[PDB]
Amino acid sequence: LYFQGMELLIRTEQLLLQNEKNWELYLSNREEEKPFDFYKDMKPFVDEAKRCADDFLELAIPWVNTERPPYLGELQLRQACDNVQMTAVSAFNGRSFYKHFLDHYQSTKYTLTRVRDFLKRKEES
């Protein structure tokens, strides 16, 4: 369970980082829209985001249903992951609606930071 929890923490950090990448790409395009190629630019970016989300869920779902961390369940985690995929696609369009993007970015950040912080506490105890 030590290794399971450590691996989950690492995958949580990786997914948080992806979420940040989405937001920074979006903001950059919002400042100055860059052209992109579906195969050279978008697909690889979206694929890496999907890898991050799937890797996280592989461990996070069994964890959430066995450890029953406070105020957190499966749907919340799946939605946090859905957001990362949506924002990865929308990030290539700087005209994506700002509040919707922000709300998706922040929701994921909130949920995953809660997971990270919980696991770091469990680690350091």
Side-chain angles (χ1 to χ4, degrees), residues 81-113 115-118:
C81 290
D82 291 340
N83 295 342
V84 176
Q85 174 162 306
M86 290 173 242
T87 55
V89 177
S90 294
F92 290 85
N93 178 10
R95 293 181 183 81
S96 296
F97 287 146
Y98 181 85
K99 182 177 178 303
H100 290 344
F101 204 121
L102 175 67
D103 288 346
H104 284 72
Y105 160 68
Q106 289 190 319
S107 176
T108 297
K109 181 164 61 173
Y110 299 158
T111 297
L112 295 182
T113 60
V115 172
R116 183 193 68 191
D117 290 349
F118 176 94

Coordinates of all heavy atoms in Angstrom, one line a residue, residues 81-118, unseen atoms left out:
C81 N -11.0 14.4 -14.3 CA -10.3 13.8 -15.5 C -10.9 14.2 -16.8 O -10.2 14.6 -17.8 CB -10.1 12.3 -15.4 SG -9.0 11.8 -14.1
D82 N -12.2 14.2 -16.9 CA -12.9 14.6 -18.1 C -12.5 16.1 -18.4 O -12.3 16.4 -19.6 CB -14.4 14.6 -17.9 CG -15.0 13.2 -17.9 OD1 -14.4 12.2 -18.3 OD2 -16.1 13.1 -17.3
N83 N -12.5 16.9 -17.4 CA -12.1 18.3 -17.6 C -10.8 18.5 -18.2 O -10.6 19.4 -19.0 CB -12.1 19.0 -16.2 CG -13.4 19.1 -15.5 OD1 -14.5 18.9 -16.1 ND2 -13.4 19.4 -14.2
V84 N -9.8 17.7 -17.8 CA -8.5 17.8 -18.4 C -8.5 17.5 -19.9 O -7.8 18.1 -20.7 CB -7.5 16.8 -17.7 CG1 -6.1 16.8 -18.3 CG2 -7.4 17.2 -16.2
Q85 N -9.3 16.5 -20.3 CA -9.4 16.2 -21.7 C -10.0 17.3 -22.5 O -9.5 17.7 -23.5 CB -10.1 14.8 -22.0 CG -10.3 14.6 -23.5 CD -10.6 13.1 -23.8 OE1 -9.8 12.2 -23.4 NE2 -11.7 12.9 -24.5
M86 N -11.1 17.8 -22.0 CA -11.9 18.9 -22.6 C -11.0 20.2 -22.8 O -11.0 20.8 -23.9 CB -13.1 19.3 -21.8 CG -14.2 18.4 -21.8 SD -15.5 19.2 -20.4 CE -15.4 18.0 -19.5
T87 N -10.3 20.6 -21.7 CA -9.5 21.7 -21.7 C -8.2 21.5 -22.6 O -7.7 22.5 -23.2 CB -9.1 22.2 -20.3 OG1 -8.5 21.2 -19.5 CG2 -10.4 22.8 -19.6
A88 N -7.7 20.3 -22.7 CA -6.6 20.0 -23.6 C -6.9 20.3 -25.0 O -6.1 20.9 -25.8 CB -6.1 18.6 -23.4
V89 N -8.2 19.9 -25.4 CA -8.6 20.3 -26.8 C -8.9 21.8 -27.0 O -8.5 22.4 -27.9 CB -9.9 19.4 -27.1 CG1 -10.4 19.8 -28.5 CG2 -9.6 18.0 -27.0
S90 N -9.6 22.4 -26.0 CA -10.0 23.8 -26.1 C -8.8 24.7 -26.0 O -8.8 25.9 -26.5 CB -10.9 24.1 -24.9 OG -12.2 23.5 -25.1
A91 N -7.7 24.3 -25.4 CA -6.5 25.1 -25.2 C -5.9 25.6 -26.6 O -5.3 26.6 -26.6 CB -5.4 24.4 -24.5
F92 N -6.1 24.9 -27.6 CA -5.7 25.3 -29.0 C -6.4 26.5 -29.6 O -6.1 27.0 -30.6 CB -5.6 24.1 -29.9 CG -4.6 23.1 -29.6 CD1 -4.8 22.1 -28.6 CD2 -3.3 23.2 -30.1 CE1 -3.8 21.2 -28.3 CE2 -2.3 22.3 -29.8 CZ -2.5 21.4 -28.8
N93 N -7.5 26.9 -28.9 CA -8.4 27.9 -29.4 C -8.5 29.0 -28.3 O -9.2 28.8 -27.3 CB -9.8 27.4 -29.7 CG -10.8 28.5 -30.1 OD1 -10.4 29.6 -30.4 ND2 -12.0 28.1 -30.2
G94 N -7.8 30.1 -28.5 CA -7.7 31.2 -27.6 C -9.1 31.9 -27.4 O -9.2 32.7 -26.4
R95 N -10.0 31.7 -28.3 CA -11.3 32.2 -28.2 C -12.3 31.3 -27.5 O -13.5 31.7 -27.3 CB -11.9 32.6 -29.6 CG -11.1 33.8 -30.2 CD -11.6 34.2 -31.6 NE -10.7 35.2 -32.1 CZ -9.6 35.0 -32.8 NH1 -9.0 33.8 -32.9 NH2 -8.9 36.1 -33.3
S96 N -11.8 30.2 -26.9 CA -12.7 29.4 -26.1 C -13.2 30.3 -24.9 O -12.5 31.2 -24.5 CB -11.9 28.2 -25.5 OG -11.5 27.3 -26.5
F97 N -14.4 30.1 -24.5 CA -15.1 30.9 -23.5 C -14.3 30.9 -22.2 O -14.0 29.8 -21.7 CB -16.5 30.5 -23.3 CG -17.5 30.8 -24.4 CD1 -18.5 30.0 -24.7 CD2 -17.3 32.0 -25.2 CE1 -19.4 30.3 -25.8 CE2 -18.2 32.3 -26.2 CZ -19.2 31.5 -26.5
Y98 N -13.9 32.1 -21.8 CA -12.9 32.2 -20.7 C -13.4 31.6 -19.3 O -12.7 30.8 -18.7 CB -12.5 33.6 -20.5 CG -11.5 33.8 -19.4 CD1 -10.1 33.6 -19.6 CD2 -11.9 34.1 -18.1 CE1 -9.2 33.7 -18.6 CE2 -11.0 34.2 -17.1 CZ -9.6 34.0 -17.4 OH -8.7 34.1 -16.4
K99 N -14.6 32.1 -18.9 CA -15.1 31.6 -17.6 C -15.3 30.1 -17.6 O -14.9 29.4 -16.6 CB -16.4 32.4 -17.2 CG -16.9 31.9 -15.8 CD -18.1 32.8 -15.4 CE -18.7 32.3 -14.0 NZ -19.1 30.9 -14.1
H100 N -15.8 29.5 -18.6 CA -16.0 28.1 -18.7 C -14.6 27.4 -18.6 O -14.5 26.4 -17.8 CB -16.7 27.6 -20.0 CG -18.1 28.0 -20.1 ND1 -18.9 28.4 -19.0 CD2 -19.0 28.1 -21.1 CE1 -20.1 28.7 -19.3 NE2 -20.2 28.5 -20.6
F101 N -13.6 27.8 -19.3 CA -12.3 27.3 -19.2 C -11.7 27.4 -17.8 O -11.3 26.4 -17.2 CB -11.4 27.9 -20.3 CG -10.2 27.0 -20.7 CD1 -10.0 26.7 -22.0 CD2 -9.3 26.6 -19.7 CE1 -8.9 25.8 -22.3 CE2 -8.2 25.8 -20.1 CZ -8.0 25.5 -21.4
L102 N -11.7 28.6 -17.3 CA -11.3 28.8 -15.9 C -12.0 27.9 -14.9 O -11.3 27.3 -14.1 CB -11.7 30.3 -15.5 CG -11.4 30.7 -14.1 CD1 -9.9 30.7 -13.8 CD2 -12.0 32.0 -13.8
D103 N -13.3 27.7 -15.0 CA -14.0 26.9 -14.1 C -13.6 25.5 -14.2 O -13.5 24.8 -13.1 CB -15.5 27.1 -14.2 CG -16.1 28.4 -13.7 OD1 -15.4 29.2 -13.0 OD2 -17.2 28.7 -14.1
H104 N -13.4 25.0 -15.4 CA -12.9 23.6 -15.6 C -11.5 23.4 -15.1 O -11.1 22.4 -14.4 CB -13.0 23.2 -17.0 CG -14.4 22.9 -17.4 ND1 -15.4 23.9 -17.5 CD2 -15.1 21.7 -17.5 CE1 -16.6 23.3 -17.8 NE2 -16.4 22.0 -17.8
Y105 N -10.6 24.4 -15.4 CA -9.2 24.3 -14.9 C -9.2 24.3 -13.4 O -8.5 23.5 -12.7 CB -8.4 25.6 -15.4 CG -7.2 25.9 -14.6 CD1 -6.0 25.1 -14.7 CD2 -7.1 27.1 -13.9 CE1 -4.9 25.4 -14.0 CE2 -5.9 27.4 -13.2 CZ -4.9 26.6 -13.2 OH -3.8 27.0 -12.5
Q106 N -9.9 25.2 -12.7 CA -9.9 25.3 -11.3 C -10.5 24.1 -10.6 O -10.0 23.7 -9.5 CB -10.6 26.6 -10.8 CG -9.7 27.8 -11.2 CD -10.2 29.1 -10.6 OE1 -11.4 29.5 -10.5 NE2 -9.2 30.0 -10.2
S107 N -11.6 23.6 -11.1 CA -12.3 22.5 -10.5 C -11.3 21.3 -10.4 O -11.2 20.7 -9.4 CB -13.5 22.1 -11.4 OG -14.1 20.9 -10.8
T108 N -10.6 21.0 -11.5 CA -9.6 19.9 -11.5 C -8.5 20.2 -10.5 O -8.1 19.3 -9.8 CB -9.0 19.7 -12.9 OG1 -10.1 19.3 -13.8 CG2 -8.0 18.7 -12.9
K109 N -8.0 21.4 -10.5 CA -6.9 21.8 -9.7 C -7.3 21.6 -8.2 O -6.6 21.0 -7.4 CB -6.5 23.2 -9.9 CG -5.3 23.7 -9.0 CD -4.6 25.0 -9.5 CE -5.5 26.2 -9.5 NZ -4.7 27.5 -9.8
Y110 N -8.5 22.0 -7.8 CA -9.1 21.8 -6.5 C -9.2 20.3 -6.1 O -8.6 20.0 -5.0 CB -10.4 22.5 -6.3 CG -10.3 24.0 -6.5 CD1 -11.5 24.8 -6.8 CD2 -9.1 24.7 -6.4 CE1 -11.4 26.2 -7.0 CE2 -9.1 26.1 -6.6 CZ -10.2 26.8 -6.9 OH -10.2 28.2 -7.1
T111 N -9.8 19.5 -6.9 CA -10.0 18.1 -6.6 C -8.6 17.4 -6.5 O -8.4 16.6 -5.5 CB -10.8 17.5 -7.7 OG1 -12.1 18.1 -7.7 CG2 -10.9 15.9 -7.5
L112 N -7.7 17.6 -7.4 CA -6.4 16.9 -7.4 C -5.5 17.4 -6.4 O -4.7 16.6 -5.8 CB -5.8 17.0 -8.8 CG -6.6 16.3 -10.0 CD1 -5.8 16.4 -11.2 CD2 -7.0 14.9 -9.7
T113 N -5.5 18.7 -6.1 CA -4.7 19.2 -5.0 C -5.2 18.6 -3.6 O -4.4 18.3 -2.8 CB -4.6 20.7 -4.9 OG1 -5.9 21.3 -4.7 CG2 -3.9 21.3 -6.1
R114 N -6.5 18.4 -3.5 CA -7.0 17.8 -2.3 C -6.5 16.3 -2.1 O -6.0 15.9 -1.1 CB -8.5 17.8 -2.3 CG -9.2 17.0 -1.1 CD -10.7 17.3 -1.0 NE -10.9 18.6 -0.3
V115 N -6.4 15.6 -3.3 CA -5.9 14.2 -3.3 C -4.4 14.2 -3.0 O -3.9 13.5 -2.1 CB -6.1 13.6 -4.7 CG1 -5.4 12.2 -4.7 CG2 -7.6 13.3 -4.9
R116 N -3.6 15.1 -3.6 CA -2.2 15.3 -3.4 C -1.9 15.6 -2.0 O -1.0 14.9 -1.3 CB -1.7 16.4 -4.3 CG -0.2 16.6 -4.2 CD 0.3 17.9 -4.8 NE -0.2 19.0 -4.0 CZ -0.2 20.3 -4.3 NH1 0.2 20.6 -5.5 NH2 -0.7 21.2 -3.5
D117 N -2.6 16.6 -1.4 CA -2.3 17.0 -0.1 C -2.6 15.9 1.0 O -1.9 15.7 1.9 CB -3.1 18.3 0.2 CG -2.6 19.5 -0.5 OD1 -1.5 19.4 -1.1 OD2 -3.3 20.5 -0.5
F118 N -3.7 15.2 0.7 CA -4.1 14.0 1.6 C -3.0 13.0 1.6 O -2.7 12.4 2.7 CB -5.4 13.5 1.1 CG -5.9 12.2 1.8 CD1 -6.8 12.4 2.9 CD2 -5.5 11.0 1.4 CE1 -7.2 11.2 3.6 CE2 -5.9 9.8 2.1 CZ -6.8 10.0 3.2

